[PDB]
Design a protein around this ligand. Structure first.
Ligand code: FES
Length: 107
């Protein structure tokens, strides 16, 4: 299959299951499904508005962050060990069941 199921957890705590596809950008997918994850810099590693928390079980299956991602995340409110920039995440079968939680506050 090319299907990759994920769940967005919105800022109110509502879980929003989404049937994505391999190769989908997590930011763009969220926006297609009415999830208020905004990407101020249009996926150019120059903001942190796309900040999400990734389920711990899937965090180590993602590409290691670029130094610019670390720089942007360091500026983000409510940073966690499992924080990533959503625009840097592309769906693969390894992210089946991954949960992307929107932080309460954005920069
Ligand atoms: S949209 Fe700006 S870094 Fe992700």
């Amino acid at each position: 299959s090319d299907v990759v199921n994920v769940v967005f957890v919105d800022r109110s705590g509502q879980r929003i299951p989404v049937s994505g596809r391999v190769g989908d950008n997590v930011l763009h997918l969220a926006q297609r499904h009415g999830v208020d994850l905004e990407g101020a810099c249009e996926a150019s590693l120059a903001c942190s508005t796309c900040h999400v928390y990734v389920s711990e079980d899937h965090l180590d299956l993602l590409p290691p962050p670029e130094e610019r991602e670390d720089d942007m995340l360091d500026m983000a409110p409510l940073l966690q060990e499992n924080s990533r920039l959503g625009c840097q995440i592309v769906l693969t079968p390894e992210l089946e069941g991954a949960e992307f939680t929107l932080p309460k506050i954005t920069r």
